[PDB]
């Protein structure tokens, strides 16, 4: 009767605090639990060892937080992934499971001062050394600098110890050097495969002294828009004033990497009061391509090339907007946020994701299920809609198509998309499911989330399910485990889960229950869900003006710089001439790209759920192991499936 379980993350990492969830269901009295971690298969060592006691007053829920030191046994050789044997002794009952170990110590970020540089100058660049939880760590880092052709010309070996995770560095570009794209490559010494890179351009250049912004009225082009692609060429000096001169503008069509220039769209237009208008008429466009069929242009993109010359002929600037999509619909729909498996007879939730042709989230866009007009839902700030459909008990493939219902537009312009959700396979067809629902809203830390636990199963055994077990996954680690009380007859129970800065940017909730039923069979039923959080800083960093707003600065003037940030932190500044960002604005540093990296290194590969319970688990990035034999699938791959 007592069934002891153990849960850990799919992939454990080194020099990191991995948490482990210990359980004993239908257990009595106290239960001594000892946890040990051994290398695989040799078992030459004892990397971790903890002891805890499970007590009825914790309802027999334990937790061991352990660390895997970075022994020299772990690396290589070579290309050969390594593994540990997690062992958990409950009294006399022993449960063991092999888990995969990541060498990746965490992350590195590189930041250069400028984006582009002139032969003869110094590139100032800082490396940010942080673990998986993003806090600064002191370790050794190798740093290379590769040329255009992909050749290292310099390698240094350094460590962020006592450097507060801030490693300053410099490199003098020689005056004799190859033009083009240069790369800074850097990696942690204990993990040479995961590499972190930043590009900086080396070119013979001058400052234009003014900027040119080209903006199409719509961020896209609608193939049947007769007016055509109308663009506003604005030009102003860096210090603010608007420019007087003359502009040449041309248009083009891009397909992947191949570009076709439209010679007959070349216009020369007068820039008055720092602005100018120029339009690409549908006619010329269709004339430049040799296709009569218009729909063949959908998927491809358009680019605009601007050349504004000051009436002095003393300065001439080049600009270009690119990747203006040609589309039949002013929106796109994605189910990348929706799970791919439902539970027969239970509500199935859809996370529809509507973007603007560029990739940006579309605000206030109504969407709906075909055949169900009732089911309607609007997109929030992040561009997502929560639609819910009640499903029938049957093993037939659910196929769901969705469209937009944005008014003002036509049915033809509405977007559409179609997925297919398969049924959750039950343990011997017991027809016992669990479903986790979450209110779709742009989540902020400090708010409280209402997690909804809906249970479905025959009345012969509901009175036995008294509690659910939940686990929070974040950044690829176990942020928190816990228990949800349930009384008999309670279909829906709610969990008030407080959101802190630790849940940023995204977190997974997986919860499950177990019981004996059918014909004496031990049953585990689980369900997961992936919830997004408002990407930001764990803390805050604002830079603004200390002085009065009236006092404009003058060359050689002393001015006050206010900095508002987290106490104790260290701030690293830099001031670049906006002329630089007229030449090259790429590979800039943002907090969002940080959260982006953090994101790409999640062990969870699915919006939630799974073909089965061992699937809910492995898909969410966890390993669930028991003393009756109800085990997960052996994860052999560090990367997520294509």
């Amino acid at each position: 009767s007592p069934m002891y379980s153990i849960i850990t993350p799919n992939i454990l990492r080194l020099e990191s605090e991995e948490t482990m969830v210990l359980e004993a269901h239908d257990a009595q009295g106290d239960v001594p639990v000892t946890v040990t971690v051994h290398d695989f298969p040799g078992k030459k060592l004892v990397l971790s060892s903890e002891k805890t006691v499970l007590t009825p007053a914790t309802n027999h829920m334990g937790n061991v937080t352990f660390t895997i030191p970075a022994n020299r046994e772990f690396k290589s050789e070579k290309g050969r992934n390594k593994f540990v044997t997690v062992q958990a002794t409950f009294g006399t009952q022993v449960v063991e499971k092999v888990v995969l170990v990541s060498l990746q110590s965490g992350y590195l970020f590189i930041q250069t001062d400028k984006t582009i540089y002139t032969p003869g100058s110094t590139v100032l660049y800082r490396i940010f050394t942080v673990n998986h939880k993003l806090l600064p760590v002191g370790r050794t880092v190798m740093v290379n600098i590769e040329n255009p052709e992909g050749i290292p010309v310099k390698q240094d070996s350094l460590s962020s110890q006592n450097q507060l995770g801030v490693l300053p560095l410099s490199w003098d570009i020689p005056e004799l050097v190859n033009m083009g794209q240069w790369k800074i490559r850097a990696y942690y010494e204990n993990s040479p495969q995961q590499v972190f890179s930043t590009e900086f351009e080396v070119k013979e250049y001058v400052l234009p002294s003014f900027e040119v912004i080209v903006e199409p009225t719509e961020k896209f082009y609608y193939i049947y828009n007769e007016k055509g692609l109308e663009v506003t060429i604005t030009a102003r000096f860096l210090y603010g004033k608007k420019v007087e001169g003359t502009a040449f503008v041309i248009f083009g069509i891009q397909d992947g990497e191949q570009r076709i220039s439209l010679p007959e769209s070349l216009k020369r237009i007068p820039i008055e009061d720092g602005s100018g208008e120029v339009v690409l008429s549908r006619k010329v466009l269709l004339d430049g391509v040799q296709n009569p069929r218009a729909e063949d242009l959908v998927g491809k993109s358009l680019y605009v090339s601007a050349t504004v010359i000051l009436h002095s002929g003393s300065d001439m600037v080049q600009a270009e907007r690119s990747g203006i999509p040609i589309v039949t619909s002013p929106y796109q729909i994605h189910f990348t946020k929706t799970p791919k498996y439902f539970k027969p007879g239970m509500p199935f939730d859809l996370m529809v994701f509507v973007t603007n042709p560029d990739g940006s989230p579309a605000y206030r866009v109504p969407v709906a299920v075909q055949g169900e007009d009732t089911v309607q839902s609007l997109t929030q700030g992040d561009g997502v809609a929560k639609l819910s459909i009640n499903t029938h008990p049957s093993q037939k493939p659910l196929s769901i198509t969705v469209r937009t219902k944005k008014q003002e537009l036509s049915e033809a312009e509405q977007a559409t998309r179609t997925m297919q959700a398969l049924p959750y396979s039950t343990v011997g067809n017991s027809n016992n499911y669990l479903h986790l629902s979450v209110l779709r809203t742009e989540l902020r830390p400090g708010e409280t989330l209402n997690v909804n636990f809906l249970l479905r199963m025959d009345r012969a055994h509901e009175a036995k399910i008294r509690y659910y077990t939940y686990l929070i996954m974040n950044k690829g680690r176990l942020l928190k485990a816990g228990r949800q009380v349930r009384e008999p007859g309670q279909d829906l129970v709610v969990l008030p889960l407080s959101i802190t800065t630790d849940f940023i940017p995204s977190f997974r909730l997986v919860a499950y229950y177990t019981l004996i039923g059918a014909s004496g069979q031990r049953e585990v039923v689980a369900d997961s869900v992936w919830v997004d959080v408002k990407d930001s800083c764990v803390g805050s960093l604002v830079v603004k003006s200390g002085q009065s707003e009236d006092r404009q600065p003058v060359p050689g003037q002393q001015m006050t710089l206010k900095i508002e940030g987290d106490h104790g932190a260290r701030v690293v500044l830099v001031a670049v001439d906006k002329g630089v960002f007229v030449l090259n604005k790429k590979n800039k540093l943002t907090q969002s790209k940080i959260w982006d990296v953090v994101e790409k290194a999640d062990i969870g590969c699915t919006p939630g759920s799974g073909k089965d319970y061992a699937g809910v688990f492995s898909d969410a990035g966890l390993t669930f192991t028991s003393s009756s034999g109800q085990q997960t699938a052996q994860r052999a791959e560090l990367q997520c499936p294509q």
Binding site: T140, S157, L158, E189
Partner: protein, 189 residues
């Protein structure tokens, strides 16, 4: 008559009012800025004598003279406690890994016909660590000419030898003195 114009810190009387003492009412006296102060065009440098035997109240005719911008110190810093005006002081410091060579402070002093910083801007020299120890039966995987703050040295034993210790060591800096994190490893045969 009014008493002698009161002493001013900025400007001092001109000739020949400085040697006069007979100040009949309705008299104007002209000042000229001291060193180091500069005249404020929009303001009159003259003063006048009142009925109750006083002078026309005036805020100081010459404003305080400014020093030339201290500048920038490659990998060092300039601490400017309170402005760069005549009589001001500034201090110098180097960034970690760099040592100070020169004056630790500078003063805005009066030179000839103007104010100039008392000392020249010093230099911050990269603090190099002493050459890494050569170990028996091993070598330093691709050495280096100079090892600075944070530079690390990786070691490797020869064939038929076993490494026992830290694969590599790094340079730490304490009181402008470079010192190795610790002892290099050993290659036991």
């Amino acid at each position: 008559s009014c008493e002698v114009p009161t002493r001013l810190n900025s400007a001092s009387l001109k000739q020949p009012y400085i040697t006069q003492n007979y100040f009949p009412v309705g008299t104007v006296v002209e000042y000229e800025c001291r060193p180091g102060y500069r005249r404020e065009p929009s303001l009159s440098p003259k003063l006048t004598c009142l009925q109750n035997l006083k002078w026309s109240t005036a805020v100081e005719f010459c404003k305080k003279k400014s020093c030339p911008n201290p500048g920038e110190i490659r990998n060092g810093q300039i601490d400017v406690p309170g402005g760069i005006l005549f009589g001001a002081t500034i201090s110098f410091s180097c960034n970690t890994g760099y040592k100070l060579f020169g004056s630790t402070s500078s003063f805005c002093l009066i030179s000839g016909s103007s104010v100039q910083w008392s000392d020249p801007l010093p230099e911050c020299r990269e603090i190099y660590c002493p050459a890494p120890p050569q170990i028996d039966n091993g070598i330093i995987q691709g050495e280096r000419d100079h090892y600075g703050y944070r530079q690390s040295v990786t070691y490797a034993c020869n064939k038929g030898f076993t490494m026992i210790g830290e694969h590599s060591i790094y340079c730490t800096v304490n009181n402008d003195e470079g010192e190795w994190s610790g002892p290099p490893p050993e290659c036991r045969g």
